[PDB]
Amino acid sequence: GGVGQLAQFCRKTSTPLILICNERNLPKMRPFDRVCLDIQFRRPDANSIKSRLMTIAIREKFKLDPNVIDRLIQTTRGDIRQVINLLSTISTTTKTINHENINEISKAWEKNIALKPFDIAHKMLDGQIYSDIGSRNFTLNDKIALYFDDFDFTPLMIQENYLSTRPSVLKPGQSHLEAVAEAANCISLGDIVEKKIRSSEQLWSLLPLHAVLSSVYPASKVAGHMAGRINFTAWLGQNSKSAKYYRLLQEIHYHTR
Amino acid sequence: MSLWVDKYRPKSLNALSHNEELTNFLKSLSDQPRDLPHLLLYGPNGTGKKTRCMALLESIFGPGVYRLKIDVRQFVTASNRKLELNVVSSPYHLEITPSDMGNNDRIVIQELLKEVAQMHRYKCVIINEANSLTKDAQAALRRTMEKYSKNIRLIMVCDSMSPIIAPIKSRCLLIRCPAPSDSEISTILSDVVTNERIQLETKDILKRIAQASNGNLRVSLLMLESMALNNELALKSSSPIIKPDWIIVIHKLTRKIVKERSVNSLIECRAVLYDLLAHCIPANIILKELTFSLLDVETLNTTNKSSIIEYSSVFDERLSLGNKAIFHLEGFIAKVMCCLD
Amino acid sequence: ASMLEAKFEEASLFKRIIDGFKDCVQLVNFQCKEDGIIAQAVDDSRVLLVSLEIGVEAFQEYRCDHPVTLGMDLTSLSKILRCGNNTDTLTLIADNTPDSIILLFEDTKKDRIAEYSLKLMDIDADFLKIEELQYDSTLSLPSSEFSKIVRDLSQLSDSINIMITKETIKFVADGDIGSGSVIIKPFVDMEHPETSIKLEMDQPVDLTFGAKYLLDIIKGSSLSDRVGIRLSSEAPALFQFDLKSGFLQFFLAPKFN
Amino acid sequence: AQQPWVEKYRPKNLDEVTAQDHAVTVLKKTLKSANLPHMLFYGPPGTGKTSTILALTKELYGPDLMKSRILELNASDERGISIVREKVKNFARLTVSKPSKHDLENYPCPPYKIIILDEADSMTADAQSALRRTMETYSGVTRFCLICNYVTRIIDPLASRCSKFRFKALDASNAIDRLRFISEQENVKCDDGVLERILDISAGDLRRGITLLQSASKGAQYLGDGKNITSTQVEELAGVVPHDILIEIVEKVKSGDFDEIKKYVNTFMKSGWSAASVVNQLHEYYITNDNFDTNFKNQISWLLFTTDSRLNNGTNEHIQLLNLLVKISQL
Amino acid sequence: EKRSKENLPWVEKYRPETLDEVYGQNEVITTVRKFVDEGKLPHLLFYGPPGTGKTSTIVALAREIYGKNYSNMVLELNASDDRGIDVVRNQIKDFASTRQIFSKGFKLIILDEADAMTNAAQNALRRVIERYTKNTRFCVLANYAHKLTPALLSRCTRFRFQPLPQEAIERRIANVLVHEKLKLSPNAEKALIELSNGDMRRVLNVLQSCKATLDNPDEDEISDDVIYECCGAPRPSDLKAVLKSILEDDWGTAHYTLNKVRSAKGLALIDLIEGIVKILEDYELQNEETRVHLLTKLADIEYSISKGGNDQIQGSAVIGAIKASFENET
Amino acid sequence: TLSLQLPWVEKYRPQVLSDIVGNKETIDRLQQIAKDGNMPHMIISGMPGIGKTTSVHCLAHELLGRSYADGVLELNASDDRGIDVVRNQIKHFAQKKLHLPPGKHKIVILDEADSMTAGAQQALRRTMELYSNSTRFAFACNQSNKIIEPLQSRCAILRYSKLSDEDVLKRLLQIIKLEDVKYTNDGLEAIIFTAEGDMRQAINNLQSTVAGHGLVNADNVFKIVDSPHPLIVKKMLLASNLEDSIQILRTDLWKKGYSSIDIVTTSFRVTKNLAQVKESVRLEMIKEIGLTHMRILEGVGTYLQLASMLAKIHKLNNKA
DNA sequence: TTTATGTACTCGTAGTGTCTGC
DNA sequence: GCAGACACTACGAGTACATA
């Protein structure tokens, strides 16, 4: 009950008090919703970091090329501390940083950050990854790894917005409705796979199969730009309300019996 | 109570003016109850299987089976989740249903049947809605009735035969409960109304109720009571056949599917399905009603009807092996839209 | 009447003897003979070996014509000994190659009589002829002193290293908190003969042992006033606790390197 | 008469099992010896595996040693991995009980105890993997008898360690002596071919046949006419569709006309017969007919198999029956 | 154990007590003997089908290296024993870190059926193996390799135990018959070879049950006929007749023939499906569509039978599938 | 029981940074860190057996010398690295005052760091951020995905790649010249092919072949150690003739003693890692392989199921 | 957020034991 | 010596992961 004690401290404190976390959207900081003055920090603009690295490079004797800082911030995803660590490590043996080995360094130090469920649905439903050219770098193994980040929300996220897009990967002679039906078939198959996974048998080696049948194949036929925008899953709320309604139905069934 | 469905129920086999052959068979069983085997009554719902079970129970021991009480029993599962399920017990018998969560009704069956078997020689254990068991409690039952039988007996009531596994079919006697004939429905409704105080212009209303009920006497009695209450206790020959709001929703969904075959109409179909699943409805019956309402639309072709029924069979198989019914139902509607378009 | 009879003077003796090595051993293989009763049992890790032996003089009456192999379980044995008044006189009873033994918990000397029985356990492991050998050193220190030293040193490191060289006992235990270096000089006292640090010398030894196993050894210090430790570079450590008529060894296996 | 005829006439001797002659002779010759292997009984339900194992245990030890040297587990009992790891392992590693003078003199007591795991196909694979080396290590002191009706659920190592005894289905030829004996003992008036009909309807089991015979005898006792039980009463009580309704179904199927077959299927399901029985009747009518082409028979055989599998999955039988009839009608 | 031998099944009675008594795996046995004579013994990993002689080989190896009391010097853990990561952290660590208690030798750890260990247990076992490998060797017996962590696979020397060939089964059968004073006809021996499917326990069990089957254990010889009633497997002549009736004869004759064959001595549709599969694999088919249809339909039928169902409908399905598959070829 | 000779895997483990082959840039950077002394926090990741933890140990040995007994705290999965009983250990070790050379710091080798819980890494976050002047950390995990992003935000990412055939061959030839065993180039290339860039596997196969036949010729190598079954599975799935695929299946997997579930899992992995055929075709191949996988896991494991899987894979591959 | 076992981790609590003290 | 104080092991409830 640490978060509850911290919230109760926030209600009653006679000293200045601040908190530092990373993800407000987690439900465990939900009580902090209106007990604190929220200040949001974002990804800084590349100009200030560029100036700081110019000062650091001219102070630490190694040469730095201005066009390289943009790609370093882009690949590091706005992580200034990791940028400084990258500069130090590169300057250990190769003090000169040019535009030749920029792609080598960017690929070697690329950060495989986890992805949020809405962004997971957006990347899964993007029509470029299933194109011929787009599959050379983003192979289906990367799609499985992207699913496995959040394996509890991706099957629910794909199902609720795979029918609210313009499809961009339609086969010739195939309409949008046919693709929707053929995706729904494999979603139904993934339901059965999940039921075998989460049962008494408890076959958890079947997760990679469920990944394909519930996220990859259904989104490989309806890929495209959103008709509206990605909506949060509603099956959880509908299922909760249905469970409570079932409980109240059982109460009146037993009372009148 | 004021409801007519539970006000006029035949207590004895003598009052069972429904099936002469089935009543005679039950009386044959009740003639020598010293060696009565485990039973399994199957048939369409609303036939009156539970009425036969209670009538046989009071024919075995005597009057007093129909007095009932409620005894909530606390049951603990994995971790410390509490799913206390009450049992509708009574002297001389015990009534249980798998209304508990299906994934862990096996423990309810195991410890409750072991508790009742600690000792008029046997106590009958009626299991309503036995087709809803999850093939795990049935495994316990296989040896439960076989090992202890001189002290416990089961009257295993279910409206369908397919989910019941082979050994349970093997060790239980099978009793068949056909649905009433339309003439018998009209006769029962006429006896009810003449014992009641509702005025009828012509017995054609009873025949119309029999036709609309489709062999289901329970919903027939419910609809007759609703009509009598709505018609100021005087039925009219021009009274429209009132349907359950569920049937209205299914028919509106079928009309929306038939007329508009776009993705957006599928979105409203999904919303309607979400509402219906929130409205305490099993997946099998809703898919069956949707399929049979789709096949009753006259603008279809025989090829479209065959495709619809084949995909309905496929997706019903999928329902029998799935957890979230919404995906299977949405897939079935998508396939229907693809075929009709 | 029964072939094997062993009536203890008091249930307290057997309770203490069982509780001496109950924790460190799960399966015990008693071997009753006319010379006495022995029990060679091995730990689950197969590192610590216990060799119980009770002479015929510790029994008020004893008679066993045929050798009997009583393989048992110490958990259930201790559970059986847990119930029953400690002043009562226990009488072990067994048949000719039986499936169980009978624990006569005769209350006081009359009235209440108990018939607790424990099903015999099929342990086919033969007794191991590890009696003794030419040990390099033979020291003898009071049980309380050794228990206190081991308990103090176990909090400082996970390994206690026992070193003997030139008539001197030295315990060292280097760890994270610190490094104990408890040392003992041998002596003898006529005033209090119980406390006397006896010693013998053939070759210096530097053998290291685990902490938990040494704690398991010192849990049995309540049985004997004196404990005798014998070490060798090519032999397991021996901890001979002297009993009223027999003994209770503890063959501990040292670590290497 | 305090018990049903199923358990009242349950075999009490190994010779009383009037089927599975190979397994019974093997078990008897093993009873003479002591080399009892880890058994694995399998077959259709009602073939007599539990009866055989109980008779074998009773003849091995006797009524006194049932409670001491027999451990029987079910799916009703908890059979998690912890139970297999502790309870079964402890009972296996315990030494055998002490046979008395009476038991040793009268019965051929062997120096081992049998662990019977009824309906063992329901255990998780992890529990079976834990059971493997328990079975292997303590072979000299305990015997394992796995009684499952599905082999495929039992993992490969247990099927390798356990000697397999398939229990053959009990058709009309195999198990007619038992039914005749039961009729003689119970004084049940019977027709000539009534028992053959009973064994035909009871597909590969004798428990169902005994239950059907008991029901028919009870009905005849109620009527009290002293009349032999005809095939009609048994056929009606068995729940199989009469030939008139099946002929009507075939006539509706032959003409096509989806609306007519749909209406007749609705009425038929209102009358409420078991759809598996209807599929069986349709199979024994269509396949044995000689008025149909080869290609039609291929397609209808595949259709009947698919419908039977889908029904065995445990689905709504109305839709499956309608689909099967419509698919047959379009052939 | 009780009453020494002669009260055990033939599976556990004829367990090899020496590395010379292991047949079939000549290369593995010779390599292991060379290893232990030259004094080097790396972390061994024995992989193979059930019944091929993995645990027998490692038990014989531990008996050869140590004395008679090999169990006093080996920490042999199995799936029956609890093998959580706490067990690895305490029992395995203590056994590997300490010195031998009965003589001067290296500790040996045998982990039979180690595929059942959890991922975290294998992760701990990785560093446990790699740290204390100076005077402790780990042996891992695994039937399944996909359940083993690739780090664990990359650490132990892999030995593959192939299914037993014909000669090894023949030699073991000859030894068993010599011991048991039993006689067996060569055709029965060939039937046993075909019935084994690479398993040795199946051979020993069938020999035991067939000796029990005979009225007179001596004198009478075990023929393939006795093998086929005792095991219950279909005879090859029955399979050939059924397949011929299906291929050439019409539905009435084929259905009657299959029913008669099944009801003659209680055959099951299973073992008959893959008997037919073997016979059809012994054919040459011009069109790949025949092979595709046969494989798919027979796999579906075998799956349905594994789930259970009506045997008559499944037999009709088998006949229909075969007859429909052998008409697309022309 | 004679004392066993140390295996060649551990006997010839490198003790200096020069002997590690492969990833020349990473090794040179580690050497420059070694002589420079300013070791930063780093996380080392890669496939198993390519020299991850040995580089960590060699760098720890080189940076600080006689202080190696107490100046480095090594932790692993065998130690119960939890949130509570272990935060105090690193807290004390980092707070421990030990006098080093001016450019050297204490090293905390959290070996096998991908197995730690989330809370342990959350505590390690501020533990690393506070005492960055005194102690430095060294994570060595097979997979870097388990490490949370705050830990990745303050660490130097050193990604090792699978060893090239030339470097493995070079170090193998070094081992042969130190051991003087007769070798043939065909046998060496067979060892390289079997190892698949896994160095410890190469050394173990070399050990087995040397001590089993004396000569490491290709025939002896293939006799002792089998070719990797992923390659056989990939060959089987890519064949054009169904009869050829069935024959490869039977002869190379069913008669070689491979479980059906192993074949199915390897086929799934090969299909998901395959790139020659069209993406959609791989999708239906994965779906069918998964259906066969469900059939195998439900209990029915038979040659017929694998044959049906291959038949349907050929149905999809040949485009009806 | 339902899932549905088995595993592992973490914390909290309740006693149980020996250790100081008057 | 009895009483309190003390820190220890043992136990129970809760959460989170499950393929690379």
Ligand SMILES: Nc1ncnc2c1ncn2[C@@H]1O[C@H](COP(=O)(O)OP(=O)(O)OP(O)(O)=S)[C@@H](O)[C@H]1O
């Ligand atoms: N061969 C047989 N001879 C005589 N009676 C038999 C035979 N097989 C079955 N029965 C009868 O079947 C009933 C009990 O059979 P069981 O042994 O319980 O069948 P089963 O093997 O248990 O089937 P399960 O357990 O549902 S798979 C008794 O009424 C027996 O008389």
Ligand SMILES: Nc1ncnc2c1ncn2[C@@H]1O[C@H](COP(=O)(O)OP(=O)(O)OP(O)(O)=S)[C@@H](O)[C@H]1O
């Ligand atoms: N090569 C062989 N030579 C002789 N007997 C063998 C051979 N392989 C197996 N056996 C016999 O098979 C019996 C059981 O096989 P085991 O080797 O003990 O177990 P396993 O072969 O390792 O199978 P798993 O994987 O442990 S279930 C042994 O007792 C032997 O009698």
Ligand SMILES: Nc1ncnc2c1ncn2[C@@H]1O[C@H](COP(=O)(O)OP(=O)(O)OP(O)(O)=S)[C@@H](O)[C@H]1O
């Ligand atoms: N580049 C290399 N140069 C020389 N030997 C190497 C090299 N890479 C690995 N080895 C050998 O591999 C063995 C130990 O490798 P490790 O580094 O311990 O494996 P690893 O990189 O830690 O992989 P994991 O994840 O721990 S299984 C020793 O015998 C080393 O000699």
Ligand SMILES: Nc1ncnc2c1ncn2[C@@H]1O[C@H](COP(=O)(O)OP(=O)(O)O)[C@@H](O)[C@H]1O
């Ligand atoms: N012989 C009969 N005469 C009149 N009503 C009957 C008869 N049998 C059954 N019913 C009616 O059936 C209703 C009970 O049906 P029920 O047993 O609940 O069906 P189900 O078992 O299918 O749910 C009662 O309201 C009763 O009026």
Ligand SMILES: [Mg+2]
């Ligand atoms: Mg049974």
Ligand SMILES: [Mg+2]
């Ligand atoms: Mg083994």
Ligand SMILES: [Mg+2]
């Ligand atoms: Mg490593």
